[PDB]
């Protein structure tokens, strides 16, 4: 699994969104599930090529954003 899989990252007020190659969703997501609530991720949901991840309390959507880039 290479960065070549994560096609794009952006976010808004409620969720942080990741775009990947088709079929790589669940794979990049399991990576995010390594992080966790105390690191800012309340949860994560992957489709085929999209991943919606959301911040925990104490965290802003931007905070999560920066934390994920660190993991990636």
């Amino acid at each position: 699994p290479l960065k070549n899989l994560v096609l794009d990252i952006d976010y808004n007020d409620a969720v942080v969104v990741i775009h990947t190659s088709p079929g790589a969703a669940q794979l990049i997501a399991r990576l995010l599930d390594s992080l966790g609530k105390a690191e800012g991720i309340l949860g994560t949901i992957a489709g085929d090529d999209t991943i919606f991840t959301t911040p925990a309390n104490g965290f802003t959507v931007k905070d999560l954003y920066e934390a994920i880039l660190e993991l990636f």
Copy 2:
């Protein structure tokens, strides 16, 4: 569905996030789908082990959480 399939319920300003054992997400989200917008749930979406469920207008997240807890 055994209550054991459900590992943890938590939330924030936009969604309630239910974690479950690998694989049980689609099964448990079935229960959440028993309810309709009326009880507050706009929609529900499960992946493999995470479920994001959101509220309808008039009910907040704190609301949906309590609601979910009652159903489980």
Copy 3:
């Protein structure tokens, strides 16, 4: 055909499109025809529920009407 998409609505965070069992990934696929330049930031489908959310600049409201347009 259109029939598959049951209801469309929204709230504070996302727009939720329901479908007949199994068509969520197909209709959600329609949405992926859009893109950032038209409001859509991303879309996830399960079996029969799709959660699409607005990019910065648009609102969950703007996005909503745009999907009806698309449909």
Copy 4:
């Protein structure tokens, strides 16, 4: 929903249907109505490919014809 299915074929074990992206679940959902008495033992679907199989007392080709019946 015909243009969804891109192909049908088979072999010494299953019937292999190909489809447009995300359709795998739609199409396989249609083949789930039939049941064992129609030949089918079961049906599975990934993202764009279904794999169906005839039950005890049925041939793959037969099944291939049967799906072609309800297609």
Copy 5:
């Protein structure tokens, strides 16, 4: 969990387990607890169906027996 398993039959190649919707992946993850050693090559679940296949050294009947065993 067992009341989720609709039925268990089979044929020449696979052992098709039907389940309640969504139950699929859970029951299959159960079979995955077995592994090659018990005569299971590999398993794959959709939404409510589980196609499994025996390993060289056990036939389809045998897989079936050991599955009713597991269950």
Copy 6:
């Protein structure tokens, strides 16, 4: 990475590819860039297992080899 691909084996019906959790859709997409001309009838993939089949004129064994060659 082919490390996401844990084990390969086959039988008288399909080639079974056990991969890391979630990797099953990605790697089936790799086998998906082959098809009939190379002997692949179809390939359906779950969360960590993938099931492929040889077309006509080709044997599962020939496929097991080609699959390693794809790898």
